[PDB]
Design a protein around this nucleic acid. Structure first.
Ligand SMILES: [Mg+2]
Ligand SMILES: [Zn+2]
Lengths: 52, 202, 163, 190
RNA sequence: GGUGGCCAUGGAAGUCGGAAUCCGCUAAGGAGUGUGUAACAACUCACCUGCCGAAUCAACUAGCCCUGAAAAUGGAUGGCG
């Protein structure tokens, strides 16, 4: 259907990401602070939910 | 931890540098924790394997003891995953030979060393045609009933030449197992001597 | 086995645990023993007779596969004999006081215990196993009037008799 | 706190010739020539190394947030050397479940045409920046190769087509479709 | 590794949870940070190594700027700026 290494490529671009608990912005997996000025670089971060 | 224990490990290495004059420098680039549990008990009657870290550059402080000059030739070999195996009874090679067990093949691409690798003209035994690894390089092959054969032979890669990725994956599928001097031995020390594993020192 | 389903003298090992009487609630080995000419009932009820006569607290079970014969030996585990070195069995159904009773003293019986530990420990000559299997205690907790907390420190026996 | 001085030297190889017009470096080697101004960054570009061996950037009496600008110029220059000696080669692979992503280039690069993404009728067209030669690869099934010299021109063209193939109103945790940058490499390896 | 350790079996062999609970190989591996897996595995993290050459790390505290910060005729540091 979709080959494994090809899949975990697009996963790298769509899935493994931290997300701001404040402003829902999408960040890379090493993030400890957010980007946005609107939330205030919160650090209330949480992984993107892995689809079941 | 590691203010008194660090000063403890210094006392265990300085003891094996004086008590045991026979030193075996081994390299363990690939190893498992259960693998050494068996090597220490398959050589328990003879040897004592001592594994350390960067601090193995402490032979200076045993040489700083105003006593031993010849430990300066042990300087250029404390680098790249080096640990020591001191033994009392080691007479000569006769023990060093019985240590070489089943250890690296696996022939990675980008390697150089051992010798002129040959593939004797024997029936491979792989599945049907499967000749894309023979045809990409070029060797006369024929399909006898079922399996593949090689109806000629020459040396694939010579000494000093690089091994490509396709000619390395084909040697691992044929079960031919060259290109390795891993967890066996690197450089021996015995009474200020300089051994060299270009073949006289065994 | 290798190329085309060729058995050749079958002698294959498979290990199992959790021995009650035997089992037989429409359940045994399978996924390993259906394919391999072994049954689910006969080779199960024969696992009783050998894993019985006071084996009824959780055991380890190696069963050697000959053509359709299952050799049901009981290989002793390190903490299963120390459970069998207990004040001997209250089995099931009242026992009701579950499994942490714990005073059995195993003085020279751990010595026999660390003797019948076949080849498993890659061992220093019992100067340390007398503490390895002496520190794996939650039930017994020592020779008649002590704790295993203070046997870890000493030990004044067996060192030069085991080698 | 203002730091009195920070600097960093670039090791220019022997293939290339870098010659700075005050603050605008120009870099010419085998493949071509590149240029980049820096009349926003307020540093001293010296060419101290002789015969030609060192591009040395100073900053000077600057504080925390400008001392950071020292190395980012340093890297923008090595990327310029690595682009005119070897050249960048971004590879991107097409991923999909059912509808095959149907790529075809149309001038030399300069027009990447994508049919049948998620079955969509609307044919997506994507220009390339000047100097970027897009090309459909071989020795792989669903794979483009973007070549050129400017890392800046090549990698945003890659993003231009990576961002053109995005799904709307779906769970992109499941619908993992599109053309994604798979390998940031070079043209010649040496 | 001793190790399907013990409790718990509904599965917890390190890992829903808990009493815990230490040795061997030791270099170093917590009877385990987690990913998850019915459980493993597989992966990973502590811990320890291989490479590199000198400053690095953590918790607090305060100054300024940002977030918190949404109202209705257009709009007010007095204005320009
Ligand atoms: Mg919807
Ligand atoms: Zn945010």
């Amino acid at each position: 259907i979709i080959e494994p290494s090809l899949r975990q490529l697009a996963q790298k671009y769509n899935c493994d990401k931290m997300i701001c608990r404040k402003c829902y912005a999408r960040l890379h997996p090493r993030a400890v602070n957010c980007r946005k000025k609107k939330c205030g670089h919160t650090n209330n971060l949480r992984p993107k939910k892995k689809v079941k | 931890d590691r203010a008194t224990w660090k000063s403890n490990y210094f006392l265990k290495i300085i003891q094996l540098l004086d008590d045991y004059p026979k030193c075996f420098i081994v390299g363990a680039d690939n190893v498992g924790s259960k693998q050494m549990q068996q090597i220490r008990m398959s050589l328990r009657g003879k040897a004592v394997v001592l594994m350390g870290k960067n601090t193995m550059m402490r032979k200076a402080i045993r040489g700083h003891l105003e006593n031993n000059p010849a430990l300066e030739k042990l300087l250029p070999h404390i680098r790249g995953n080096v640990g020591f195996v001191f033994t009392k009874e080691d007479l000569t090679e006769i023990r060093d030979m019985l240590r070489a067990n089943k250890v690296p093949a696996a022939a990675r691409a980008g390697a150089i060393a051992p010798c002129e690798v040959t593939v004797p003209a024997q029936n491979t035994g792989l599945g049907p045609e499967k000749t894309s690894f023979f045809q990409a390089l070029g060797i006369t092959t024929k399909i006898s009933r079922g399996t593949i054969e090689i109806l000629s032979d020459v040396q694939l890669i010579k000494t000093g030449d690089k091994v490509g990725a396709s000619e390395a994956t084909l040697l691992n599928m044929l079960n031919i197992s060259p290109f390795s001097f891993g967890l066996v031995i690197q450089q021996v020390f015995d009474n200020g001597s300089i051994y060299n594993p270009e073949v006289l020192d065994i | 086995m290798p190329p085309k389903f060729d058995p050749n003298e079958i002698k294959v090992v498979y290990l199992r645990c959790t021995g009650g009487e035997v089992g037989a609630t429409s359940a045994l080995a399978p996924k390993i023993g259906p394919l391999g000419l072994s049954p689910k009932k006969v080779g199960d009820d024969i696992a009783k007779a050998t894993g019985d006569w006071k084996g009824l607290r959780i055991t380890v079970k190696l069963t050697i596969q000959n053509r359709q014969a299952q050799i049901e030996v009981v290989p002793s585990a390190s903490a299963l004999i120390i459970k069998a070195l207990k004040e001997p069995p209250r089995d099931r159904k009242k026992q009701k006081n579950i499994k942490h009773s714990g005073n059995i003293t195993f003085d020279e019986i751990v010595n026999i215990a660390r003797q019948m530990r076949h080849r498993s420990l890659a061992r220093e000559l019992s100067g340390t196993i007398k503490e390895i299997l002496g520190t794996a205690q939650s039930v017994g907790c020592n020779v008649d009037g002590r704790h295993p907390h203070d046997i870890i420190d000493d030990i004044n026996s067996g060192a030069v008799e085991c080698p | 706190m203002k730091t009195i001085l920070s600097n960093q030297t670039v090791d220019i190889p022997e293939n290339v010739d870098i010659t700075l017009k005050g603050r605008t470096v120009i870099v010419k080697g085998p493949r071509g020539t590149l240029r980049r101004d820096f009349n926003h960054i307020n540093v001293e570009l010296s060419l101290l190394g002789k015969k030609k061996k060192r591009l040395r950037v100073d900053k000077w009496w600057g504080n925390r947030k400008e001392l950071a600008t020292v190395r980012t110029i340093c890297s923008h220059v090595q990327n310029m050397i690595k682009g005119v000696t070897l050249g960048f080669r971004y590879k991107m692979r097409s991923v999909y479940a059912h509808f095959p992503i149907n790529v075809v280039i149309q001038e030399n690069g300069s027009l990447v045409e994508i049919r049948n993404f998620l079955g969509e009728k609307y044919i997506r067209r994507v220009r390339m920046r000047p100097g970027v030669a897009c090309s459909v690869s071989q020795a792989q099934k669903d794979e483009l190769i973007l070549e050129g010299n400017d890392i800046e021109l090549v990698s945003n063209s890659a993003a231009l087509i990576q961002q053109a193939t995005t799904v709307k109103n779906k769970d992109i945790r499941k619908f993992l479709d599109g053309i994604y940058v798979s390998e940031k490499g070079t043209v010649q390896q040496a």
